[PDB]
Amino acid sequence: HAADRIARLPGQPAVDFDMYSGYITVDEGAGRSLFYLLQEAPEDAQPAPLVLWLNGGPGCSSVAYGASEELGAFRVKPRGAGLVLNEYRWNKVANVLFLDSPAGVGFSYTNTSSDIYTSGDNRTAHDSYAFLAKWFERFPHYKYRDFYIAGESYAGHYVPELSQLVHRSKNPVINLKGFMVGNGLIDDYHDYVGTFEFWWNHGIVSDDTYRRLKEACLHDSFIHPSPACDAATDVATAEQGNIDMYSLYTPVCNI
Amino acid sequence: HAADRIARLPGQPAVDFDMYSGYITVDEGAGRSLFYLLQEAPEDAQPAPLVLWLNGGPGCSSVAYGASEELGAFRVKPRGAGLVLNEYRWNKVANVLFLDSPAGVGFSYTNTSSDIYTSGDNRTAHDSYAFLAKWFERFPHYKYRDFYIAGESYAGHYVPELSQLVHRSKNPVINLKGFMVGNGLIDDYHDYVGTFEFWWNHGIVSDDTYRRLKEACLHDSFIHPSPACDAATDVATAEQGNIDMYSLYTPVCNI
Amino acid sequence: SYDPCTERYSTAYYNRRDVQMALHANVTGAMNYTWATCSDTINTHWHDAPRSMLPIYRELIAAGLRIWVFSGDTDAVVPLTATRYSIGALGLPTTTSWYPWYDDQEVGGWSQVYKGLTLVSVRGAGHEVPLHRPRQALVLFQYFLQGKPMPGQ
Amino acid sequence: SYDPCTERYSTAYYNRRDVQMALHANVTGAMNYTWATCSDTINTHWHDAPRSMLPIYRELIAAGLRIWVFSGDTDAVVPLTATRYSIGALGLPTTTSWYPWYDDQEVGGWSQVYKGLTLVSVRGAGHEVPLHRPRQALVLFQYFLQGKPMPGQ
């Protein structure tokens, strides 16, 4: 674990808390290893809970997002030149563990190159569980700590799925207290439903397109829409124009 | 008309266009007179159309709003200390006529004090028509000009109502070309309907309250809601909290 | 840059005797009441007010007048959906389906052209469009005046 | 102050050999591919993905776990209404109806407490809450951690 400690990152201001990062092997046979980043809470906040943070995609990295442009301790300067402190980092209040998942995302990797074409909720959940078990073994001072799993987007899937293994697992070292999901997939149908209504109520699609979507997509999955569904969304996309779908009232990056 | 000319307003930067303001008597018997403010387009833009601008309320002044914190040539400094030029004023492109209406609003007035308790769409429309006719007589260089009526809010009522008299009027001096309505009352029922859906889609009311509103108000008028309707909206208001209902994502004035 | 207290200022400014003068307002000093942005009395003593304007619309539409309706999309008082449903009740036919309109390189909002009416939304604007989205509100006005559809690209 | 180009920066920063080093990343220099924020392949080669999470929710809810769901209200990708309808499908009972929550004197967003779940909206935030509403996102996290309802007044 001590080997995982980070001294100072390039262009990183001096701080009052520690950080670690490194790989954990989740599938020996396959050669699947996951990269993590642990940013701890300062001493005055200790002993703080342990919070596992997961970004979605699927295929998106928790370090990239969560850690770097969201709740992580720092923000990257332009041209990836340096770091600035995130005044509102969540590590002000908890021990935050960022997990690049699944294998192949961010810095995580697979020895078995086909891994990359067979990813899924099950394996992802399973490998994460593994990661956890091993991680704790390497950070035994974390055993028994209050533990929470949190994430956003596709992680609406990852969080509870993992939460479930864990809970069922009957792993006594992991004190799972709950989970938190931000803007996440919860139920395909309902989500599809609320999605369209929201768009229409935001003047982002036409009446017809609103209707086309409700008719094409309500029986699909968000991740695996039917071809009707995509045809529909292709239109919606044309209607939405050059706006940032993830933040309606803010500008798009011009670079 | 020349008597209506304004030289310079207090704390008002120097400009390249003229302005006028004064009263027009719309009901001799009653002693009802309407105050107006005409801000003209600069020479290079002339001869520009004539645009009558109306604010809503009902009971709100076009000068206060339209002219002063919206499309008018200037903006008032803090403490009503002065003026700044509105870089995007509509008088950059048209001759803009701001009308305080009805009598009793802003600077407009009534000799008959009960006027103030009997206001309505009909009279308002009628007095405006009168105002117009007379106004043109005083600004004869405006006769035949392309003319448009525009407004927002309750003016969703005023604009087309007036537009209609005018059109029907068969007044040959007024070249009415059309009207434009911004965030305005168009149809009570539909508006009520879209209103609630919008709120719910903006996370401003609960599911129950959303339902309560749809049940209490759909048969009412916006201006004269039933007591069910208000009871409902009283809740909605409690749910909305201290936000600016007219601009969801912006701050409220703290003074 | 945005200032929610504007009405405070106006009310100050209009109550000034020098401004009233320059305005030719309250010539005789007779108006023995303070100037306010609205009259609560009128506001609260309102009479006739038809439920629908749709018919006037149908009329004027037939009369061939130019008709534009707009909506600041972050207003909650008389919101976009309200307008959408209302206009939709006119049952007009579409000439140009909902499309994004631009101001330079940004989406200023959206627009749909019907046979006899143009509907325009202003992305990010509250109730007082020319107050929250001044640059875009001006664009809107110009196209309306030219009787030209809001611009793509 | 807000910067939509953040991903540009990260991608730069993570590709640096000094940062990888300090991170203990790509120790052997073996990873013969550039670091990216997402993997399009995985992204596009996705397999199993149940339609609903509701059952896990029911489970864990019964198991007595703490469950919070949140939503940045100006996100269009996985929006608020989507979440509203989804949670509503759980049919849980309300312990505290929808109310505005505050951060100092502002409304940070809204919240509703059910029997076994807390739902929280973050007024004005896009998909990445801690990016668009950093101050409020932090408040959210603290209350969750304390297992305490978002604050009124």
Swiss-Prot record, chains C, D:
Active site (UniProt): D75, H127
Binding site for substrate: R123, G124, A125, G126, H127
Glycosylation sites (chain numbering): N26, N32
Protein name: Serine carboxypeptidase 2 chain B
Species of provenance: Triticum aestivum
Lineage of producing organism: Eukaryota, Viridiplantae, Streptophyta, Embryophyta, Tracheophyta
Gene behind this protein: CBP2
Full protein segment contained here: 287 to 439 of 444
